[PDB]
Design a protein around this ligand. Structure first.
Ligand SMILES: N[C@@H](CSOO)C(=O)O
Ligand SMILES: [Fe+2]
Length: 186
């Protein structure tokens, strides 16, 4: 039974129930994520920006089953083209906008990766991706507005691949938390 999360804290309690079991109901997780109405006061503690690139800020470690984190994208900051390491990956905008570009998995041959499509994710919208859908790049293309997103990955993962748009070649990248539970972890 899916209720509206009243607060970020309420959302987190609800996610612990939804991930109590071995499987994931994606549409339900996505629906509850979308239904949370972003309230900046509730997440200011996690919203720690870096001038030069986007940051990942751990919010909740889950029940063994997922990580919840807040990413803060300065003006012009974006990701690589990457995968999600056999995990569910949910992305909800808490502030500003992000452009999401989708790519197919590259073939063996070295070859420019062409965009499958792109969309603009707006405040409070929740997107979903997994490796079976494809790869994506996420960017704050704004010149004036920082963006903040709320991401849920299950199972948790610490590593992923970045793809060279010109060749399709991939490189394993380890991901680091800029902060955990509101504490800067340098
Ligand atoms: N996967 C990237 C961000 S876009 O993922 O929805 C990351 O978590 O660093
Ligand atoms: Fe991603």
């Amino acid at each position: 039974e899916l209720l509206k999360p009243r607060t970020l804290a309420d959302l987190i309690r609800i996610l612990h129930e939804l991930f109590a079991g071995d499987e994931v109901n994606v549409e339900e997780v996505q629906a509850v994520l979308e239904a949370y109405e972003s309230n900046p006061a509730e997440w200011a503690l996690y919203a720690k920006f870096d001038q030069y690139r986007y940051t990942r800020n751990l919010v909740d470690q889950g029940n063994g089953k997922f990580n919840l984190m807040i990413l803060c994208w300065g003006e012009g900051h974006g990701s690589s083209i990457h995968d999600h390491t056999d995990s569910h990956c949910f992305l909800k905008l808490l502030q500003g906008n992000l452009k999401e570009t989708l790519f197919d998995w590259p073939d063996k041959k070295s070859n420019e990766m062409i965009k499958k499509s792109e969309r603009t994710l707006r405040e409070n919208q929740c997107a979903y991706i997994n490796d079976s859908i494809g790869l994506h790049r996420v960017e704050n293309v704004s010149h004036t507005e920082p963006a903040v997103s709320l991401h849920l990955y299950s199972p948790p993962f610490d590593t992923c691949h970045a793809f060279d748009q010109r060749t399709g070649h991939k490189n394993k990248v380890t991901m680091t938390f800029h902060s955990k539970f509101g504490i800067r972890t340098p």
